[PDB]
C-alpha cells in the first residue's frame, strides 16, 4: 500500500510530445477557407484537395489518419463545432455519426480520427466533406479549418520534369 | 494493479526550470506596447538588443523560443497574443498561428519548441508579434517578455586584443 | 530514365503565371513563394539544383525567352548576364542551371526576379512559367502540429 | 652562446587574444563623455548596464579590469585617463594613479590585473574614471570602453518558470 | 641564471612570415579606390563586392579574417587612419568603436581584424563601411584601400556553365 | 553562333598546353549579318588554367 506522492506541473501551452508519423508516411498540412455562416444554420464545405496533390498519381495512395483541427478569429464568443463526414443529406444529421468531433468548449480544438479513413484512398476524400456549426452569428474568413493528413510515400514526386530531360 | 497516489498542490513559481539544451545561451528582452483599443489589432514589430547587434552576432541559429507576457493587474477581460509574420489582415496571424497565450487560461505563455528551428536571429527581425484585446486598455499595460535561445557567441569569454 | 533529386533533398513545384506583355518590351516577374514554403523556419533551407520550363498557350507566335537574375536598372541586360535561357526556337523549351544555385538560402530567390521578352505581343496569362526547385526536406517533415494550438 | 633571432614586425590588431581565467565573463561597455576644457580634469561617473542591474547580479567579484579609449582621430595633443575613487581634487588621482593610459605612448589601455581583485560590482559604482586633456577638445570626442571580469551569473542558462 | 646573448638582426622589407590562411579556407583581394578628400574631414566609402562575388551563390559563405592594408600615392606627409565598421550616424564616431586601426604613423600600415568577423556572412559587409580620415588634404586617387577576406571555399565554382554543356 | 539551338562553342583540344601570357597574342572576332548597336553583344570567355600558387595567403603586413 505504497503511497506515492506526485506535482502535477501544468504545461504551457504549445509544449507537448505533439504526435509522430508512422514511418513510410508523409505528412501533408492544408487548409480551407470558412464560408460566411448564419447563426445556428450549419453551413458544410467541400474537401478541396491541393493543386500539389491533384494530380491523378497520387489519388490513389493511402490516408493513415486525419488530424482537423481549427483556429478562429479571436472573437468568436459561441461555441463552435466541426467534424468530418458523408455526403449527408441533412447537415446537422451528420454530427449525430461523427466518431469524434472538434469543439470551441473542450479546452483542446481537435478532432483526430484515428481510424475512420485508414486506409481509403487519398482520392476518395473528395466525396467526403466537413460540416460546421455554430451558436454566434459568424462573418466570413472568420473561421479557417485547417486539416493535416499523411499518404504512403508520393515516392515519385522526386524526380524532375523530363524536357529537356 | 490499483493504485493509490496524492495530488500536488504547488506555489505558484515553483515550476522547475528548463534549460536551454547545451551549448546554448538565454537573451531575455522586454518588449512594451501602447494603445491598443476595443477589439482591433496592434501589431509592434521586435527588437534585438543591442549587445545583439553586432554584425557577427546577427547570424546564429535560434533554438527555442518563448513569450510569456505580464499583464498589468488592471485589465478588465481577456487579451491573447501571437508571433508570426506580417500578414496584411492583422487579426489573420491568429489563423496561422502556432500557439497563442491567453489570460483567461491558468497560464500565460507560448513556447514554439518547433517552429523556429535553425532560424538566423537576421530574419527573426522581420517577425512581428501581434496583440488582440476583448477590452478596450491603457496604453503600456502589457509587456511581451520574450527570450530566444540564441547559440553563444565566442564573443563573451576574451577581453579585445589591446591595440584599439 | 528521368534525373533523380540528390539523394538528401526533395523537390517542389509551383507556378507563376506572368502579366501581360507588349511587344519588343520586357518585364519582371519576381518570384512569390508557395505559400507553405514562405515561413521564416522554411526560408533558411539549402538550395542545389534548379530549373524552370514555360508552357505557351499553343496560339502564340514568335520568339520568346526568360532568364532568372537580380534586378538591375536597365531591366534588359540582364540576358547578357544569364546563365542560361529558356527559348521557343529550340526544339527544347527548356532552360535549366544545376550550378548556378547551389549553396543559396530559399530567402535569397526573393531578391531576384525572373523576365520574359516576346517578339510581338500576347494578351494576359498566355504565358505560365514553371519553377521546380531543388531543396533540402523540411525538417518540418516531422509530424502533426501539436494539437494545442 | 651566441644566437641570432629576427623581429616580428607585425599588423595593428594582431596581439593575441588574452583570455579571462576560465569560469569567467566580460562585459564591454560604451562610456561617452563631455566638454572637458584645456587643462582641467573632467570626472565622469561609471555605470553599469541594465543586464547587471538585477539585484542578484550586482554581488559578483570581479576578477580583471581593463580600460582602452578611442580617441576621435581629429585630436591635437595629449590626453590621460585613469580609475582611482572619488577624490575631492580632481586632479590628485594621478598621483595615487594605478596605471595611467596615454596618447602618445604607441598603445592606449591601462590593465588593472591586480587591483581590483574580489571586488563586488556593487561598489565598482562608486569609482569615477577621470580624464585630462593638453588641449581644448570638442565633447563626446572620447569614448572610454572599459570591461570587467565579472564571474558569470547562473541566470543566462535558464528559461523562466512559466508562471510570472 | 643564464645571461643569454642574441643578435637582432633587422629584417629587409618584404622578409616575413607573412601569415597563413587556415585550410579549407580560400583567400581573396581586391581594391577600393578612393574619394578626394579635404582635410581633417572623414571621408566614408562602400565596401563594394566583387563581381566575381557577387553571385548570390556566395553572398552566403563565412568571412574568416580580414586584413585592411592601405597603400597610399608615394607623397602624402600627414598622418592618414581607416578602419571599417557598422553604418556609422557620425564617421568621427566610428573610430570610437574601431578594435583596430590602420595608420601611416606605426611603422606597418596593417590592420587585421582577427575577430569581429568571423564568421559572419560574406554577403551583409555590404552593410559594413570602411572609413578613412586624414590630416592633409588629399587630392583623388591618391589613397587605395586594399583590403584581403578570405571565406569558406566556393566550392561550386569549379564546374564551368551548362549549354551547349 | 546564333542559328544552332546551343549558341556555345567550346574546344578542350586547341588550347592544352599554352600560357596565359600566349593569349594575349590572339582576338576573338565577330560578324553580323546585318548591324547591330555597341553592347548589344558581350562574349563570355571561361578559362580553364592551373591555380595559382598565389594561392597562398595575405601579402605579408610590410606592405
Redesign the interface.
Given at each position: 500500500?505504497?503511497?506515492?506522492?506526485?506535482?502535477?506541473?501544468?504545461?504551457?501551452?504549445?509544449?507537448?510530445?505533439?504526435?509522430?508519423?508512422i514511418a513510410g508516411y508523409?505528412?501533408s498540412?492544408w487548409e480551407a477557407s470558412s464560408d460566411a455562416i448564419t447563426a445556428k444554420a450549419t453551413n458544410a464545405m467541400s474537401i478541396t484537395l491541393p493543386h500539389?496533390l491533384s494530380s491523378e498519381k497520387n489519388k490513389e495512395l493511402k490516408v493513415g489518419r486525419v488530424?482537423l483541427?481549427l483556429?478562429?478569429?479571436?472573437?468568436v464568443a459561441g461555441r463552435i463545432k466541426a467534424c468530418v463526414a458523408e455526403k449527408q443529406a441533412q447537415a446537422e444529421a451528420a454530427f449525430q455519426v461523427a466518431l469524434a468531433v472538434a469543439d470551441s468548449s473542450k479546452e483542446?480544438?481537435?478532432a483526430?480520427y484515428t481510424d475512420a479513413f485508414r486506409g481509403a484512398t487519398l482520392g476518395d476524400l473528395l466525396n467526403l466533406q466537413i460540416y460546421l456549426y455554430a451558436s454566434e452569428a459568424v462573418p466570413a474568413?472568420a473561421v479557417?479549418v485547417?486539416l493535416?493528413v499523411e499518404h504512403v510515400r508520393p515516392t515519385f514526386?522526386?524526380?524532375?520534369?523530363?524536357?529537356?530531360?
Amino acid at each position: 500500500a505504497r503511497v506515492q506522492p506526485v506535482i502535477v506541473e501544468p504545461l504551457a501551452a504549445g509544449q507537448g510530445k505533439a504526435i509522430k508519423a508512422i514511418a513510410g508516411y508523409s505528412i501533408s498540412k492544408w487548409e480551407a477557407s470558412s464560408d460566411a455562416i448564419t447563426a445556428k444554420a450549419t453551413n458544410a464545405m467541400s474537401i478541396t484537395l491541393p493543386h500539389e496533390l491533384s494530380s491523378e498519381k497520387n489519388k490513389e495512395l493511402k490516408v493513415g489518419r486525419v488530424l482537423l483541427w481549427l483556429g478562429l478569429l479571436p472573437s468568436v464568443a459561441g461555441r463552435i463545432k466541426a467534424c468530418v463526414a458523408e455526403k449527408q443529406a441533412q447537415a446537422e444529421a451528420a454530427f449525430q455519426v461523427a466518431l469524434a468531433v472538434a469543439d470551441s468548449s473542450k479546452e483542446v480544438v481537435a478532432a483526430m480520427y484515428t481510424d475512420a479513413f485508414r486506409g481509403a484512398t487519398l482520392g476518395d476524400l473528395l466525396n467526403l466533406q466537413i460540416y460546421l456549426y455554430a451558436s454566434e452569428a459568424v462573418p466570413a474568413k472568420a473561421v479557417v479549418v485547417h486539416l493535416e493528413v499523411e499518404h504512403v510515400r508520393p515516392t515519385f514526386d522526386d524526380f524532375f520534369t523530363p524536357v529537356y530531360r
